[PDB]
Design a protein around this ligand. Structure first.
Ligand SMILES: [Ca+2]
Length: 223
């Protein structure tokens, strides 16, 4: 997260860190046994880490659970990142408490202007590299599709939406992928991609979760 602030320990209880020997992506807990993340974050042997704040210090509220099954969206396109969403089932149910909680799925899509909360342990520099140990937060508005596509060099589909700032300075970044975009208490987006980080004229692009509720529900009920 570039231009954000320190969230505060466990203030984003649904945030998870995906670990494969090191933190490589974020995710969101949607129930005691399932996590939603980005399809481009797929890796074999993923361990899900819940209740985390500082990912390099054991603070006492962590729960480390390995994935038993991973399901990348059937139509995921690695060339365009269209349908960049993936479900991960935990080998054992997470213990829900004040520091580990699930986030609700949307019943409808969010509109432009709506304020959302984006979070993650990704790079904090628009130029260079600096990874934080504690969770970072950023408040950003959903933008119109026009502002989204204006200076884009890549395809932006109906399964994506932009959020952030056109003048740059604030944006998600590498390492934040798979993480949550929460608006009005609902998981509306998944950190997906962007051209660089916090660059002028190029806001971040997010997977539009409201388009996948049916698939998510049907898949979890059958697996
Ligand atoms: Ca920790």
């Amino acid at each position: 997260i570039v231009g954000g602030y320190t969230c505060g320990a466990n203030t984003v209880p649904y945030q998870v860190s995906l670990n494969s020997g090191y933190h490589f992506c974020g995710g969101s807990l949607i129930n005691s046994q399932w996590v939603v993340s980005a399809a481009h974050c797929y890796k074999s042997g993923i361990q899900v880490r819940l209740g985390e704040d500082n990912i390099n210090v054991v603070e006492g509220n962590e729960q480390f659970i390995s994935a038993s099954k991973s399901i990348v969206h059937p139509s995921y396109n690695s060339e365009t990142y269209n349908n960049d969403i993936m479900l991960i089932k935990l080998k054992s149910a997470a213990s829900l408490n004040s520091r580990v909680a699930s986030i609700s799925l949307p019943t409808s899509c969010a509109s432009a202007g709506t304020q959302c909360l984006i979070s993650g342990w990704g790079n904090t520099k628009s130029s260079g590299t600096s990874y934080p140990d504690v969770l970072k937060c950023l408040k950003a508005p959903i933008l119109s599709d026009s502002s989204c596509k204006s200076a884009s060099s890549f395809i932006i589909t109906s399964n994506m939406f932009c959020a952030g700032y056109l003048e740059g300075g604030k944006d998600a970044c590498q390492g934040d992928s798979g993480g949550p975009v929460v608006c009005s208490g609902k998981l509306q987006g998944i950190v997906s991609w962007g051209e660089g980080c916090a660059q002028k004229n190029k806001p971040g692009v997010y997977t539009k979760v409201c388009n996948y509720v049916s698939w998510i529900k049907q898949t979890i009920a059958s697996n």
